[PDB]
Amino acid sequence: SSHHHHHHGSRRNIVGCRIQHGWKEGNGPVTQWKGTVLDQVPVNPSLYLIKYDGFDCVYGLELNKDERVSALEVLPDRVATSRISDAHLADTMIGKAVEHMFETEDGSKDEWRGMVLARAPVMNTWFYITYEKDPVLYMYQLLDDYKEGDLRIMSLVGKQVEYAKGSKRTGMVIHQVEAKPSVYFIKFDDDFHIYVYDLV
Amino acid sequence: ARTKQTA
Ligand SMILES: [Mg+2]
């Protein structure tokens, strides 16, 4: 965000780019983060959706405006053009409820009910997914899970929302899932997770 | 199968 002067500020298009930056929360140390920018929210173009290396959840961050971000560098690395291994499975998987198997410590089975929401932008071979017992936005290469037998297959945008916790968290509806139009992405203030709910 | 991380 450069003040190309006075009332104007210009901004590089970083959708699809690898980025790295520092992160400082309160009186902690700066931590180092490296991620792939997936999208820029239409109803709030300073808000980006980001997949960070080593974190399964997708995060929503105002990368240019959030004071907690420092030394924001967009990298020259280009995400490799991948073709999806089984396109038919990939396409038919969208919008479907799924049983996604996860291991806990020393191999006890933990099966999570979920819903595949979409093919991820930018990172072609990855899928947007959320879970009944954890309604935030996750990202995984599900065709790997499927081939290993670990995956079994079975507009309000712009509006604000409020959610009761003896508290109230307010948030905004930022995206409608194309495969299932009654399912939306929600970004709450002071939470960088993307929440996923059916708002029927 | 995958392992679950934490928030
Ligand atoms: Mg179950």
Resolution (A): 2.2
CATH number at residue A48: 2.80.10.70
Q: Give residue A163's domain range.
A: 1-200
Task: Tell me if chain A has a CB within 8 Å of the CB of B1.
Answer: yes
For tokens 């410590």, what's the residue? Answer: A105
Domain count, chain A: 1
Cβ burial, residue A184 (10 Å; 0-12/13-18/19+)? buried
Inter-residue contact A188 to A196 (CB < 8 Å): no
In degrees and rounded to multiples of 5, residue A194 shows phi and psi of -100, 120
Q: How far is CA A180 from the centre of its chain?
A: 17
Q: Which residues of B touch A109 (CB under 8 A)?
A: 1
Task: Give the C-alpha separation, A135 to A137, whole Å.
Answer: 7
Residue A60 in tokens: 């929503």
Neighbours of A172 (CB within 10 A): 19
Contacts of B5 in chain A (CB under 8 A): 55-56
Q: Report yes or no: A148 at the B interface, CB cutoff 8 Å.
A: yes
| Interchain pair A110, B4: CB under 8 A | yes
For residue A139, give the amino acid letter: M
- Asked if A195 and A183 touch (Cβ cutoff 8 Å), the reply is no
In whole angstroms, give the CA distance from residue A19 to residue A27. 24
Is B1 in contact with A101 (Cβ distance < 8 A)?
yes
